[PDB]
Amino acid sequence: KTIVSMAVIRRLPRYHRYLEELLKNDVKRISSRELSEKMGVTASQIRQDLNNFGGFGQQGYGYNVEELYNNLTKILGLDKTYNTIIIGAGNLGQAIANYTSFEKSGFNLKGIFDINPRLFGLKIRDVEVMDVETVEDFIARNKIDIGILCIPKDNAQYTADRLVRAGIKAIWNFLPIDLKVPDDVILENVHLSDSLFTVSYRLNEEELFKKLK
């Protein structure tokens, strides 16, 4: 559970993303209305989302872009440091280990784990592939906060259970399975199909709307 609702929380990185860019194109000032146009969120809902955390900008003036960007940076906790690990050193785990932008936002990859002894010692950027049998000692020893799961679904639950009982604080999960974790552990499920299926929806919408409406 959360102080702010998950619906709000999920818009926040989107605001952050859009502001960053505005910042990159030296746009200085943004209105809720401008944000609303781009974001597909009502201007009143944007004010409401932001009002949870305070009063950047004011009275008919929009927001200072740099200030709102930076406040969002703090609100998302990106001024902190998170020790991460990846489980699964196959294509997906290596692809994720290669999301190097995350290091700048405070996610420090500490280790990658696999079951395949052929992969032990493999160096992926800065880190070694180690035997997942050591992962629980490793978690406690390196104060790991987030376990990223990039393995086949088959034994994912037992893997989540080991990360949990070793003190993991959160699991970033790529698998198509709803894992059970205790209520105090953050579990975030990536479902890429939720993005792809909007592509099929859109390719089809004109045609659907002969049929339906």
Residues that bind its own copies (CB under 8 A): 2-7, 9-10, 12-14, 16-17, 21, 40-41, 53-54, 74-78, 80, 82, 90-92, 94-96, 98-99, 101-102, 105-107, 145-146, 169-170, 172, 176, 178, 186, 188, 190-206, 208-209, 212-213
Instruction: Kindly give, in sequence order, each residue whose CB lies less than 8 Å from that of residue 188, ignoring residues fewer than 6 positions away.
Output: 170, 171, 172, 173
In this structure, are residues 85 and 148 in contact, taking their beta carbons and an 8 Å threshold? yes
Euclidean distance between CA atoms 23 and 73, whole angstroms: 13
The amino acid that residue 3 corresponds to is: I
Among the candidate windows 36-44, 92-100, 136-144, 180-188, which touches ligand 8NA by CB under 6 A?
A: 92-100
Q: Residue 22: enclosing H or E segment and its boundaries?
A: helix 6-24
Judged by beta carbon, residue 57 or residue 93, the one nearer ligand 8NA is 93
Q: Is 159 in the site for ligand 8NA (CB under 6 A)?
A: yes
Judged by beta carbon, residue 21 or residue 126, the one nearer its own copies is 21
Judged by beta carbon, residue 56 or residue 120, the one nearer ligand 8NA is 120
Residue nearest ligand 8NA by beta-carbon distance: 90
Binding-residue pattern over the window 126 to 155 for ligand 8NA, x denoting contact by CB under 6 A:
------x-----------------xxxx-x
| Torsion 28-56-107-95 (CA) sign | negative
Q: Is 17 in the site for ligand 8NA (CB under 6 A)?
A: no
Q: Which parts are annotated binding residues for Zn(2+)?
A: 21, 133, 178, 191
List C-alpha distances in Å: 184 to 22, 40, 58, 109, 162.
36, 32, 37, 23, 15
CA atoms within 13 Å, Cβ hemisphere of 140: 8
Euclidean distance between CA atoms 22 and 40, whole angstroms: 17
Binding site for ligand 8NA (CB under 6 A): 87-93, 95, 98-101, 113-116, 132, 150-153, 155, 159, 174-176, 193
